[PDB]
Design a protein around this ligand. Structure first.
Ligand SMILES: Cc1cc2nc3c(=O)[nH]c(=O)nc-3n(C[C@H](O)[C@H](O)[C@H](O)COP(=O)(O)OP(=O)(O)OC[C@H]3O[C@@H](n4cnc5c(N)ncnc54)[C@H](O)[C@@H]3O)c2cc1C
Ligand SMILES: Cc1cc2nc3c(=O)[nH]c(=O)nc-3n(C[C@H](O)[C@H](O)[C@H](O)COP(=O)(O)OP(=O)(O)OC[C@H]3O[C@@H](n4cnc5c(N)ncnc54)[C@H](O)[C@@H]3O)c2cc1C
Lengths: 490, 490
């Protein structure tokens, strides 16, 4: 309790995002990151719709878009002729932001710092002890071992999570059967076609400048450790069927696989997990970091609330309840996509043909678009029956002010407080909310939503806690307010 | 020309169906079947919606339904929880008729005979010669070799088609990588669960009486010739993971695979191909014989018409044009389903999960239902733009007579003549059709169809040749009649 409120283990993008969220929630956040210096990641990155919407409601979207290429559509499982159609989903931001992870990390690190989080680099957590009041973290640092005492510890320490094992949380799942290499390497060859291809021997992307030079190589072969330029070239030759001249300078080289695992519990007492610490899977569709950043924004406000007292144990438990199912579906969909890309002219090629056809129908395209981009995420939480809007994402709504001015809910959410939106003129609900005004802001505005709602009680993460029609009463809102956001003041 | 009008090579179900069709068309049909006696086939069979509708419009449905079990829905690629929904497609016969092929063969053989086709058993075609006027078939028969002269020869002689090779028609496609066994064998074991199952080692169906005895075994293993009871038992043990006691009496045992081939041309001069002679593929979904019987009904009326003179060369060419694309899609969908059933917990199991979900949506379920049952078949033929009803199946329409009595188009089609249906009161179209009355029947009736049509010119196979709205003229109908059904009489 005495060193800090929350110790965030791991200063990757997820840990950094969480620290920002905890600071926005008015609690102390100490990030302990093992590495002195950041390391290399894929130089191509993707933040999809719901992540973009999430950044917007935290006021980070602008800095993430500056200088950024965006994609207005996406392939699906190596199908490029019927791309995922952002027009078929409801958003104010129909695009994917192609931000390299290194840049996402740098931006979040600066934000955590400006928000007052303490970030210690070269500090490795080596031990973890928990009792009814606090967590103690043991740390190997540049000036020797020391202990940190906190109310909570969150493992944001990646796929090889120290926190997860120390807390005795299971990581059930499958081991890899697919072997991929990725690299940024040089070719002397000119006019190497820039494309993805699928042969009987694997999947290959080559993306080099037409004049030669440093380029992107991804190679995937069906049924961990150092990678050499020779390894990469041999793999490329196997898949492609023709050698490609690859030379120094070599900028980055890595291995990855399709091991698919998920933490059985996202919470064990005063220890929680987020990001790859909580789920790993093959990188297909660019979903891992998106899921993690959203884990962080789900958790941050709830954990700060718990520390401050008005967030209940029940509330904190909804982190696992809400977010475990999401990553579960991500694991499954990445595995499914690997089946859809399997090199095999006999059966899989014909299947891909029908899937491609189906992608040209609005209903199926909408399904896979919602899946990849996160627009289909909604929660079933604290059911009383619930209003249709309960659990839906409201972060992208825009209201009309009394003078006709646009009032984006994304902007209202930047202060990281829950909001009561009065869409219809419900002075009774506005008044009923007064005893919670130390926590919840009330904003009246004109808007029609579908399905209809006269009022929306919105969580700091942009999802709707409670909603009301003309039949809703102040008593019902009082009950929801108490359950979600604690007892009335005074 | 002098022995017979058409020589049908092969007296399997497709050859027998075709002979019936040729007789209905008023031409001679001689079926030459190599085998003296029929042989064994799968004891479980399936005739789907469009086949059922087709039998109806030839007046054979009743005899095919007598004593028959029907299925009101179907699994898809070993998915049983969201079956294909016959309610989502337009038909008067929402079911699959579970007729064993041996019974289909016997029924069609009796019908061909009663219709006046000549059927010779134990007569093997060994040679084929073709000129500008006729085909000569050389035959090894019970009283020695002889020759048959005909206007046309149709190879309905199965996957190993003699006619196809003799005519120099290619059979491009893939060789098998999947090995299946099927058998009717005895077990002494009691209460062997009746079910389909998919394990990491294959696909297996066991269907035995609870008290033991003769039962159905199908086993499929992923990457031709005699099969023993030992072979079957060893395969069952590999897939199931536990041996099953199998003993005599053994009633039937067979091998099959997923070789997928299709005749590059369905017609070469005076030689045509139908049925498995024209296309083979893995038996999944029960589509092979359905496709063949429909091949036969597409061809029969057109070929008889050609023999009689009013059917043009252009008309006969539409057999290939219309039917080749159909079997092409069947080959592809069977290959695709094998991908969907592939034993593989790593990737395919998760994919199957999403496919199962999608099958619970009307749009995707309708798609696969139409695919398997043939309700999605429609033709793009003799485009003039064409009326929306052109090429659609009208065989299941029912009209109201002048006295209110129901007048099924299926019954009207039994005489095997094209029909002009006057749905609105178009005396001008009725009159315009008189010079073709030796070939085409005119029937007035009340009915609203969707999309709207005032008149439908229906082919003997139940598909629409031409349709008209109020703007259609008698001149347009004259032109269509001439193109489809020959010059006006007199
Ligand atoms: C090739 C590739 C391409 C990808 N592309 C995309 C994409 O386009 N879009 C997308 O959303 N996702 C993508 N991903 C997935 C994404 O990179 C991960 O989901 C993301 O790195 C997870 O972030 P994290 O903060 O949870 O974990 P990490 O990035 O692994 O950070 C964990 C941090 O914890 C620190 N740590 C570990 N142990 C300790 C300890 N004991 N004490 C202190 N600190 C510790 C580590 O040093 C590390 O810095 C891709 C992944 C790969 C491999
Ligand atoms: C296990 C299994 C289950 C199946 N289940 C279904 C199902 O449920 N539904 C479905 O629609 N389909 C099913 N099928 C496919 C179906 O059996 C075939 O499509 C069907 O047999 C094709 O009929 P056919 O008349 O074209 O050829 P065949 O049945 O092979 O008949 C060809 C005939 O030609 C004769 N012949 C060959 N050469 C000569 C010659 N030179 N001279 C004279 N005669 C010759 C042969 O003796 C044979 O009798 C299944 C197939 C298998 C293997």
């Amino acid at each position: 309790a005495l060193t800090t409120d929350v110790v965030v283990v791991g200063g990757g993008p997820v840990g950094l995002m969480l620290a920002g969220e905890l600071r926005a929630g008015g609690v102390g956040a100490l990030v302990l990151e093992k590495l002195v210096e950041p390391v290399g990641h894929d130089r191509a990155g993707a933040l999809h719709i719901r992540t973009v919407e999430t950044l917007d409601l935290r006021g980070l979207l602008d800095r993430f878009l500056e200088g950024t290429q965006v994609a207005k559509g996406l392939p699906f499982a190596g199908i490029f002729t019927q791309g995922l159609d952002f027009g078929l989903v409801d958003t104010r931001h129909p695009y994917t932001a192609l931000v390299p992870q290194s840049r996402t990390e740098a931006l979040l690190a600066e934000h955590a710092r400006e928000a007052g989080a303490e970030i210690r680099r070269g500090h490795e957590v080596t031990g973890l002890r928990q009792d009814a009041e606090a967590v103690e973290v043991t740390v190997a640092g540049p000036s020797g071992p020391y202990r940190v005492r906190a109310r909570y510890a969150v493992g944001c320490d990646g796929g090889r999570s120290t926190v997860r094992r120390l807390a005795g949380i299971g990581f059930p799942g499958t081991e890899a059967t697919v072997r991929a290499l990725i690299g940024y390497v040089t070719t002397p060859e000119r006019e190497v076609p820039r494309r993805w291809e699928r042969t009987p021997d694997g999947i290959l992307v080559l993306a080099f400048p037409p004049e030669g030079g440093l380029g992107r190589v991804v190679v995937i072969e069906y049924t961990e450790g150092p990678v050499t330029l020779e390894d990469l070239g041999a793999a490329v030759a196997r898949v492609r069927g023709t050698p490609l001249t690859l030379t120094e300078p070599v900028s980055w080289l890595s291995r990855f696989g399709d091991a698919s695992r998920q933490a059985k519990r996202y919470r064990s007492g005063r220890v929680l997990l987020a990001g790859d610490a909580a789920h790993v899977h093959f990188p297909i569709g660019g979903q891992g970091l998106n899921t993690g950043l959203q884990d962080a924004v789900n958790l941050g406000w709830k954990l700060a609330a718990r520390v401050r007292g008005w967030g209940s144990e029940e509330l904190l438990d909804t982190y696992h309840d809400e977010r475990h199912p999401v990553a579960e579906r991500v694991l499954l969909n990445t595995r499914a996509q690997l089946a859809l890309m399997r090199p095999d002219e006999q059966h899989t090629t014909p299947l891909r043909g029908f899937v491609e056809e189906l992608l040209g129908t609005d209903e199926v395209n909408r399904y896979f678009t919602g899946m990849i981009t996160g627009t289909d995420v909604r929660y079933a939480t604290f059911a009383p029956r619930p209003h249709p809007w309960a659990g839906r994402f409201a972060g992208g709504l825009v209201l009309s002010g009394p003078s006709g001015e646009p009032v984006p809910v994304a902007e209202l959410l930047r202060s990281a407080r829950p909001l009561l939106l009065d869409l219809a003129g419900r002075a009774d609900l506005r008044e009923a909310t007064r005893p919670w005004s130390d926590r919840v802001s009330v904003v009246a505005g004109e808007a029609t939503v579908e399905p209809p709602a006269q009022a929306l009680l919105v969580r700091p993460d942009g999802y709707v806690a409670w909603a009301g029609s003309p039949a809703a009463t102040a008593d019902e809102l009082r009950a929801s307010l108490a359950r979600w956001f604690g007892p009335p003041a005074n």
